């Protein structure tokens, strides 16, 4: 049947729930940290980016399944 289509939506759907919240928390914490201490700005951003990518590493993993399920 078309049950693979549910798997197509579930991977991208449930996959984006976690990272969707996670990306929001990371940048919000960085922006507050930049606002309180502007001179550590160049350093915290590097920490933000090296971790914010780890969050979508699972989201891309969901998208990888989202196309593997299709074909």
């Amino acid at each position: 049947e078309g049950l693979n289509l549910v798997a197509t939506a579930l991977a991208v759907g449930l996959g984006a729930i976690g990272p969707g919240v996670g990306i929001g928390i990371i940048v919000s914490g960085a922006v507050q940290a930049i606002g309180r201490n502007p001179e550590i700005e160049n350093r915290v951003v590097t920490y933000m980016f090296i971790g914010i990518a780890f969050t979508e590493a699972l989201a891309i993993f969901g998208l990888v399944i989202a196309f593997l399920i299709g074909f």
Partner: protein, 48 residues
């Protein structure tokens, strides 16, 4: 005196070391305070 010691030790970053405590570079204008007796006869204290 100790509150200054306790607080200023915590605040060490030059970026946050602004406002009154900011040790400005290239000093250009200096103001000074003098206190003197309202009435004379004090001796050499006023002259000193």
């Amino acid at each position: 005196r100790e509150v200054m010691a306790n607080l200023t030790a915590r605040v060490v970053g030059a970026a946050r070391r602004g406002t009154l405590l900011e040790k400005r570079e290239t000093v250009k204008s200096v103001a000074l305070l003098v206190v003197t007796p309202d009435r004379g006869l004090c001796g050499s204290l006023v002259a000193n």
